[PDB]
C-alpha positions as a Markdown table, in Angstrom:
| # | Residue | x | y | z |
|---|---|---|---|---|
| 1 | Unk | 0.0 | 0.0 | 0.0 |
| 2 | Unk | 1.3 | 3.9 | -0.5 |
| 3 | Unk | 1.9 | 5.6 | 2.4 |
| 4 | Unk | -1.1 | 7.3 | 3.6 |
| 5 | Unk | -0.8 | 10.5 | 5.7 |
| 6 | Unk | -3.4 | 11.7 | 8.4 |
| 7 | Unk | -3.5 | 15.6 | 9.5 |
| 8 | Unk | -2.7 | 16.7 | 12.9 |
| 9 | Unk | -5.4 | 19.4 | 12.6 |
| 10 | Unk | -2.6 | 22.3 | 12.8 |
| 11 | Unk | -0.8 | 23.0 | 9.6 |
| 12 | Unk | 2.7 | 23.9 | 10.8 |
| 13 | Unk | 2.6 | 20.6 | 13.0 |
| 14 | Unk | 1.8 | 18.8 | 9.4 |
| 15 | Unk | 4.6 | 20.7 | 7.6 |
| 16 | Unk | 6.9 | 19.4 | 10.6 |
| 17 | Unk | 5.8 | 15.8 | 9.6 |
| 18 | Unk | 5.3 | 15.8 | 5.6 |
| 19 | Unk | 1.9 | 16.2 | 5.9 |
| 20 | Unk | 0.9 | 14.1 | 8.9 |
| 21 | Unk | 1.1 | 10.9 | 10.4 |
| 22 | Unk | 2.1 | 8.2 | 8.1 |
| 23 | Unk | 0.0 | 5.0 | 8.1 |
| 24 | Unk | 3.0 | 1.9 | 8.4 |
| 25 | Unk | 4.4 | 3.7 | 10.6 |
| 26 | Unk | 4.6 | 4.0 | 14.7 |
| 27 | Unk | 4.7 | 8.2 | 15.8 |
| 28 | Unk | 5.4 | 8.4 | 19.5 |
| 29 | Unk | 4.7 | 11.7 | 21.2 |
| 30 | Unk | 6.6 | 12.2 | 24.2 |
| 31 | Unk | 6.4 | 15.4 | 27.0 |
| 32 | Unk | 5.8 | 16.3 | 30.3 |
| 33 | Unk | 2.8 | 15.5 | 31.9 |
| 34 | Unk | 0.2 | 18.4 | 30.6 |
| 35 | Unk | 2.3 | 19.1 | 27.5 |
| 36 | Unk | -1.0 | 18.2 | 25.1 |
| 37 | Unk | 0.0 | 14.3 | 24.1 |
| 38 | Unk | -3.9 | 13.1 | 24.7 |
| 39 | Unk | -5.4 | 16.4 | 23.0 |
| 40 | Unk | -3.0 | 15.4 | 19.9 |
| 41 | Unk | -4.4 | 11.8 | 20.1 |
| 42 | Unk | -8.0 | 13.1 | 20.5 |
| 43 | Unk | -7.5 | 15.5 | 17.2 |
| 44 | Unk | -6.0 | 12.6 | 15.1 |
| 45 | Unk | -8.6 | 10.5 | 16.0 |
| 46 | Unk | -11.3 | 13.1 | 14.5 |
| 47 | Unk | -9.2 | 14.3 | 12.0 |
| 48 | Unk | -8.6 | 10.7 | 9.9 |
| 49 | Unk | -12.3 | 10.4 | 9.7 |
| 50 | Unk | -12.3 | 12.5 | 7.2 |
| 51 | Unk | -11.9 | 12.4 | 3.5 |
| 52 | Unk | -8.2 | 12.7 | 2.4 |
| 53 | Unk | -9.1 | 16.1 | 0.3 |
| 54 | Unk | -9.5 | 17.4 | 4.2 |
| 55 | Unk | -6.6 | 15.3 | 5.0 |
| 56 | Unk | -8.2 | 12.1 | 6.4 |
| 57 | Unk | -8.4 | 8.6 | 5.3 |
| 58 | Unk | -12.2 | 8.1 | 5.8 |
| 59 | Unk | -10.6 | 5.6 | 8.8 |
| 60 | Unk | -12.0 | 4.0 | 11.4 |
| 61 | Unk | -10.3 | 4.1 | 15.4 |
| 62 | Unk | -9.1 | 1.7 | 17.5 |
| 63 | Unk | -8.3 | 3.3 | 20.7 |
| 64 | Unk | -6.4 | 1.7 | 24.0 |
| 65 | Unk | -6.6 | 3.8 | 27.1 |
| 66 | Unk | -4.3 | 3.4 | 29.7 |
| 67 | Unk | -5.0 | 6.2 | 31.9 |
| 68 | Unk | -8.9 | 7.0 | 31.6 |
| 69 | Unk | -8.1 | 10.2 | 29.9 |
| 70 | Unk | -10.3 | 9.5 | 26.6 |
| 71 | Unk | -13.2 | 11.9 | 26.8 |
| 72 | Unk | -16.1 | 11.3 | 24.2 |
| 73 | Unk | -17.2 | 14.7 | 24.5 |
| 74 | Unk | -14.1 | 16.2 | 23.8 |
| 75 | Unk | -14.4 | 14.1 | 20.5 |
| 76 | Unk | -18.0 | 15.4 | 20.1 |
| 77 | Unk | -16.2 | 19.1 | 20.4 |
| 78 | Unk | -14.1 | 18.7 | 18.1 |
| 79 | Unk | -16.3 | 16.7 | 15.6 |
| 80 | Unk | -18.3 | 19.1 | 15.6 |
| 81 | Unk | -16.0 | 22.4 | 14.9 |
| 82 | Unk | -14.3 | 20.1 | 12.1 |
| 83 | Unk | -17.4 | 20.0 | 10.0 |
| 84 | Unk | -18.5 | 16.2 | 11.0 |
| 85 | Unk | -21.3 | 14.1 | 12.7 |
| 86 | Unk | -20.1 | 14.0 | 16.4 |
| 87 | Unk | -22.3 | 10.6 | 16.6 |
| 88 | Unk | -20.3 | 9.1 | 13.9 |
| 89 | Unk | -17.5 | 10.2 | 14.9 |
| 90 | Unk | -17.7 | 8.7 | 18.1 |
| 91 | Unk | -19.2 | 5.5 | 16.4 |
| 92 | Unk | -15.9 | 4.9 | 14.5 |
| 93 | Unk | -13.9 | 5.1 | 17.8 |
| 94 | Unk | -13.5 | 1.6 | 19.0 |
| 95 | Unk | -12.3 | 1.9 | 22.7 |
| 96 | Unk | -10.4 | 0.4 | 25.4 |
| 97 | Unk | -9.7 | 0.2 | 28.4 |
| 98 | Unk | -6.0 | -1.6 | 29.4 |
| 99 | Unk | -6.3 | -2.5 | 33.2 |
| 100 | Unk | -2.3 | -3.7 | 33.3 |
| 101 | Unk | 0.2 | -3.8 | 30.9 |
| 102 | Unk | 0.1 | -8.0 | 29.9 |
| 103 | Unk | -3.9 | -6.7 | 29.7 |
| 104 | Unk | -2.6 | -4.0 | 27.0 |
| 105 | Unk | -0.8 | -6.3 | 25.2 |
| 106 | Unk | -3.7 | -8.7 | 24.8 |
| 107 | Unk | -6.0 | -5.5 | 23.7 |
| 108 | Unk | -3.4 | -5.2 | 20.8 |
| 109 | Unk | -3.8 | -8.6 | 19.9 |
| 110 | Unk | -7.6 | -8.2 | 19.7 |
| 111 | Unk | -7.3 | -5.1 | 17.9 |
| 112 | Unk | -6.3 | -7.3 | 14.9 |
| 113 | Unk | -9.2 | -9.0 | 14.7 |
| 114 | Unk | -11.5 | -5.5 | 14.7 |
| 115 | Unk | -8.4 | -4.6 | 11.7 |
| 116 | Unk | -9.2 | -7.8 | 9.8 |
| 117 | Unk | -12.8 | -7.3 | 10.0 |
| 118 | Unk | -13.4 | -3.9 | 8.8 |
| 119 | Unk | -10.2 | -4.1 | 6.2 |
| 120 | Unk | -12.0 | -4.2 | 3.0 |
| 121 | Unk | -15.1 | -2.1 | 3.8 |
| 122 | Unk | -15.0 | 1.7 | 3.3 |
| 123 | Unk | -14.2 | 2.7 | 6.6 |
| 124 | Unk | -11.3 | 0.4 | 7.4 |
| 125 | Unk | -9.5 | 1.0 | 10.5 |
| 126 | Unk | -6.6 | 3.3 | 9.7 |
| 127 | Unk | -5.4 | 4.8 | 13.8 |
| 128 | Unk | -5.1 | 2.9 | 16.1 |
| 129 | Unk | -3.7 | 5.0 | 19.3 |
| 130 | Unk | -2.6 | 3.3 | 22.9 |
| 131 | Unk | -2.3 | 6.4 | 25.0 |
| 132 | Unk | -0.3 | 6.1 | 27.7 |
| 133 | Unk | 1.6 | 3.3 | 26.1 |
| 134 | Unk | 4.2 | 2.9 | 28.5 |
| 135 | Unk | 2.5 | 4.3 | 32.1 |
| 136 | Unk | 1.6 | 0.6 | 32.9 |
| 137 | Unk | 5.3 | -0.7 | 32.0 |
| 138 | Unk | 7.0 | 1.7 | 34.2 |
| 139 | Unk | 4.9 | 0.7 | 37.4 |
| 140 | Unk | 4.9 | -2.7 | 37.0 |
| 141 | Unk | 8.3 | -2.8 | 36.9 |
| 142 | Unk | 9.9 | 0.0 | 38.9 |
| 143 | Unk | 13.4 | -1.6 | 40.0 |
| 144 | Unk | 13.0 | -4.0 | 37.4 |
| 145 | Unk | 14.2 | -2.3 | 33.9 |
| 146 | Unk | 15.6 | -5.3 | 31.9 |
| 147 | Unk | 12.2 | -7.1 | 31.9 |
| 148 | Unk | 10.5 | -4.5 | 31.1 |
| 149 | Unk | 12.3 | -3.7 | 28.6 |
| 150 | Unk | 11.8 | -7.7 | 27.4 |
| 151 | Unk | 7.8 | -7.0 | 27.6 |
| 152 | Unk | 7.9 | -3.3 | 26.2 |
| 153 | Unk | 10.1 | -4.9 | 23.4 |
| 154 | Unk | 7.3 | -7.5 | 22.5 |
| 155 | Unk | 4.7 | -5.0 | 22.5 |
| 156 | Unk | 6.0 | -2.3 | 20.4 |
| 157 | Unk | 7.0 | -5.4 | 17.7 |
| 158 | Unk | 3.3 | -6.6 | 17.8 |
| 159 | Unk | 2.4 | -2.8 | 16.7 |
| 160 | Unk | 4.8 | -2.3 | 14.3 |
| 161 | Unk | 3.5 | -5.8 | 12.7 |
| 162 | Unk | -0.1 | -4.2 | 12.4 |
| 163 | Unk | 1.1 | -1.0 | 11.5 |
| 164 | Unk | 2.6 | -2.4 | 8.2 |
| 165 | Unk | 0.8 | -5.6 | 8.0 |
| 166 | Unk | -2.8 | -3.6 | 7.7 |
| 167 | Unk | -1.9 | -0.5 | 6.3 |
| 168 | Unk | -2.8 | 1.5 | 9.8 |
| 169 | Unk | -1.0 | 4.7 | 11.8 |
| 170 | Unk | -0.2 | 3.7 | 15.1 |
| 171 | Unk | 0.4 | 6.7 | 17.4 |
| 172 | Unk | 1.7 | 6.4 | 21.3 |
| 173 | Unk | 2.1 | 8.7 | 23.4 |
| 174 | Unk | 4.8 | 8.3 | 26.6 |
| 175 | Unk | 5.1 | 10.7 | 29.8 |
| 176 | Unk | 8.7 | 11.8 | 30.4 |
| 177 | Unk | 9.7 | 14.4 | 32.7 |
| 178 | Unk | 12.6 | 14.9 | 35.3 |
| 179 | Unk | 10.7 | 13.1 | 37.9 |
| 180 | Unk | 10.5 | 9.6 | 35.7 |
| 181 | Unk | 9.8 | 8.6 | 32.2 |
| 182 | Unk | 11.9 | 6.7 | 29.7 |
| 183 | Unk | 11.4 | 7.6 | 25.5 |
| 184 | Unk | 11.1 | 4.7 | 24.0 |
| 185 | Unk | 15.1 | 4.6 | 22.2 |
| 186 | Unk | 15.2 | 3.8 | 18.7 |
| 187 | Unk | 11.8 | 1.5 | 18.6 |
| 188 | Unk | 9.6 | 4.0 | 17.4 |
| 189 | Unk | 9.3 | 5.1 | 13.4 |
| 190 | Unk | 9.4 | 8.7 | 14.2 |
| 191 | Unk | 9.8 | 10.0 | 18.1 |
| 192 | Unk | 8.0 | 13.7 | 18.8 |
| 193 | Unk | 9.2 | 15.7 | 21.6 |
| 194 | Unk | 6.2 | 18.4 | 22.7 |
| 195 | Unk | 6.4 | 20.8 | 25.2 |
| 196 | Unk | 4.9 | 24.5 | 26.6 |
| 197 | Unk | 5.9 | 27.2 | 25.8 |
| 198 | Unk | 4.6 | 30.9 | 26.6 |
| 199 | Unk | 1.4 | 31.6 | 26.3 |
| 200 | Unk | -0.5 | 28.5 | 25.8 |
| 201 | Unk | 1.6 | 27.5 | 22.6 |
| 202 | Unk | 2.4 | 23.6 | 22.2 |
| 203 | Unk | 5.7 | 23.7 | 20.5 |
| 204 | Unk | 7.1 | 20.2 | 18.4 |
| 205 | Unk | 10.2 | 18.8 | 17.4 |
| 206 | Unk | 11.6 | 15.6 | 15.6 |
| 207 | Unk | 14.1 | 14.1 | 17.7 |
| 208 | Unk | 16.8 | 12.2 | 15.4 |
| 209 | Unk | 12.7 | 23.5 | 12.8 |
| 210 | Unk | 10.1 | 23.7 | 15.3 |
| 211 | Unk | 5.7 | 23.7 | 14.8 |
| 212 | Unk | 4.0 | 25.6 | 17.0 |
| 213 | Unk | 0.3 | 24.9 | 18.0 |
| 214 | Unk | -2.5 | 25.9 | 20.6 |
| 215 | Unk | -5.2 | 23.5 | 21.3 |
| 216 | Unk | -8.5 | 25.3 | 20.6 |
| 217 | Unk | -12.2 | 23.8 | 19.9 |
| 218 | Unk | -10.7 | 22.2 | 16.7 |
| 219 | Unk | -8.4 | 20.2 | 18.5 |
| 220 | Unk | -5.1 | 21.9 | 17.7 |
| 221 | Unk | -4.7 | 24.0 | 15.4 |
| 222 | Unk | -2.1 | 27.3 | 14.4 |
């Protein structure tokens, strides 16, 4: 399949990335706690429901919550000030909730079967987003870092496999700070690194120029 590219609602952010998100690929987002990663996750998850002329992929979500932090009407807010049905949206949005992280990894392995199901209809699933992909990890296994790194390895190989298997954007998001937090090293297709900066600007950068962002009624946007 061609590389298919969802908008991040803000167009400097897209310029950042070529466009947007690429499907067959993993994006991880990674900040302080309050830096925007969820509201970033809650934009794409609107914005690939569109048509690609608007820069969707007419997609359907798969969503695995780690933290309790998906809000439906926040969807329904931005649905709504992107031009679309906040009942479909939210229809599209298959979600989950990931009590532990061997529970996550078992949502994953579900989330193929949804994938294989809705593959050749015309709203296939093309996001699927596990936000906060590493919170369970880290306190499972505080004192414990090489087996977590053993399980965290696993998992981010089973996404990559339905990332490129199905033709689907996977986007994770990771809470680092000075007070704990790990990026994920080099297992990622493209890492993020978002921040604050004054005056309610977001402000994102590729690690190995700058967007700048505010999150608004749209989601983000400029």
């Amino acid at each position: 399949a061609t590389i298919g590219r969802i908008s991040t609602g803000s167009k400097s952010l897209d310029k950042l990335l070529g466009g947007g998100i690429e499907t067959q690929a993993i994006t991880e987002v990674f900040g302080e706690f309050g830096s925007g990663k969820t509201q970033l996750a809650h934009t794409l998850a609107v914005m690939v429901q569109l048509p690609p002329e608007e820069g969707g992929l007419n997609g359907s979500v798969m969503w695995i919550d780690t933290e309790n932090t998906f809000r439906p009407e926040r969807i329904r807010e931005i649905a709504q000030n992107r031009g679309l049905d906040p009942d479909e949206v939210l229809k599209h949005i298959a979600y989950a909730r990931a009590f532990n992280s061997n529970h996550q990894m078992l949502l994953v392995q579900q989330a193929e079967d949804m994938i294989k199901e809705l593959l050749n209809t015309d709203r296939p699933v093309k996001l699927l987003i596990v936000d906060s992909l590493t919170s369970h990890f880290r306190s499972e296994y505080i004192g414990a870092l090489a087996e977590r790194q053993q399980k965290l390895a696993k998992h981010l190989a089973d996404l990559h496999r339905l990332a490129n298997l199905y033709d689907i954007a996977v986007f994770v998001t990771n809470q680092v700070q000075a007070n704990g937090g790990h990026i994920l090293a080099h297992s990622a297709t493209l890492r993020v690194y978002l921040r604050k900066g004054k005056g309610g600007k977001r402000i994102a950068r590729l690690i190995d120029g700058e967007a700048v962002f505010s999150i608004t009624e749209k989601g983000i946007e400029d």
